[PDB]
Amino acid sequence: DKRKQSLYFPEEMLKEIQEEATRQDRSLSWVVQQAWKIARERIKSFPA
Amino acid sequence: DKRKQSLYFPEEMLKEIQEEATRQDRSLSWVVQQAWKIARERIKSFPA
């Protein structure tokens, strides 16, 4: 069940994401979702 | 240099991100940025 969310990126980073989106013929949202799925565990281990 | 971007997430996923943001006393944007920085390489290796 989908939900819209405005985020802030550095220029360089947004362009990096869009490059992967067009390379893979994907939405921005889908690439960022895959980044989360990959990183979740490593991030959930960050401290305080 | 910052830039605003609307993305779409599943409910569950947005809530997972916000949980890490408040746990770490961070913005949503900052957590998602860290997810990208972690996953970039693995994603840049995806195919077609």
Author numbering:
A (entry chain A), B (entry chain A): 5 to 52
Please give me the paper's original passages concerning this structure.
We show that CdbA is a tetrameric ribbon-helix-helix DNA binding protein and changes conformation upon c-di-GMP binding. In vivo CdbA is essential, while CdbB is not, and depletion of CdbA causes defects in chromosome organization and segregation resulting in defects in cell division. CdbA is abundant and binds globally to the M. xanthus chromosome.
We obtained two crystal forms of full-length CdbA-His6. The first structure (traced residues 5–52) verified that CdbA is a RHH superfamily member, with crystallographic symmetry generating a classical RHH dimer. The β-strand is terminated by P14, leading into α-helix1 (residues 16-28), followed by a loop and then α-helix2 (residues 32–48), with a strongly kinked region at A43/R44, and a C-terminal tail traceable to A52. The two α2 helices run antiparallel, with kink residues I42 and A43 packing against their counterparts in the opposing chain. Successful model building of the first form allowed us to solve the second form via molecular replacement. The tetramer interface displays different hydrophobic packing between the two crystal forms we observed here, suggesting that it may have inherent plasticity that allows it to undergo this change.
